[PDB]
Design a binder for this molecule. Structure first.
Ligand SMILES: [Zn+2]
Length: 211
């Protein structure tokens, strides 16, 4: 066994010292700490600084060993697969007409911008559905293709509370978290200014959007 990851408790969030390529864990765990509905025996200890049970649980779920890089968005999908804490309604246009798609979930694999986008194909006309957001309610997190340029606040369909941030190669990169609600970027146990770009997720709390 190696020794436990060291921690810091910063403005209500436990954060993990950078070591052994653990940043994907840190990024995911920092987001889970935003959801008061998320819980279990190993998480109750993590919230207090006693982090190795849950951290070990993250390696088990992903089949990865301590020391290997991973994917913070994949890990959020795993841990949140049995939660359903938000509702998103889309309008979907194809050659048959227009219809609504209802998604109830905690993690959504969608881009969180208020523009038009494709999602699925209609099995009666075989065209791709051209889609747009009609509403978002509750709490949850979008996991998404990297937004690598700044995004005007008015473009997000929801008000972001925080974003996983990923810089570098898909091979050789590094995770951090833009904590928008606090005003800084968390990078290991340290603090940096918001990167404002490079975002791989978008977390929202108590959404109540009509568009
Ligand atoms: Zn159709």
């Amino acid at each position: 066994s190696l020794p436990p990851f060291k921690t810091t408790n910063l403005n209500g969030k436990i954060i993990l010292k950078q070591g052994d390529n653990n940043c994907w864990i840190n990024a995911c765990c920092y987001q889970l700490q935003a959801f008061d509905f998320f819980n279990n025996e190993a998480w109750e200890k993590f919230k207090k600084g006693d982090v190795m049970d849950f951290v070990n649980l993250c390696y088990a779920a992903t089949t990865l060993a301590r020391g290997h890089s991973g994917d913070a968005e994949y890990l959020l999908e795993l841990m949140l697969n049995d939660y359903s804490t938000a509702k998103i309604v889309l309008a979907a246009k194809c050659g048959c007409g227009e219809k609504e798609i209802v998604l109830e979930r905690a993690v959504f694999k969608l881009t969180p911008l208020k523009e038009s986008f494709n999602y699925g194909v209609c099995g009666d006309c075989m065209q791709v559905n051209t889609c747009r957001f009609l509403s978002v309610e509750g709490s949850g997190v979008f996991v998404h293709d990297i937004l690598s340029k700044q995004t005007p606040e008015a473009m997000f369909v929801v008000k972001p509370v925080m974003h996983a941030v990923y810089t570098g190669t898909t091979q050789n990169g590094h995770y951090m978290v833009d904590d928008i609600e606090h005003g800084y970027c968390v990078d290991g146990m340290g603090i940096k200014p918001l990167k404002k770009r490079c975002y791989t997720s978008t977390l929202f709390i108590n959404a109540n959007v009509m568009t």
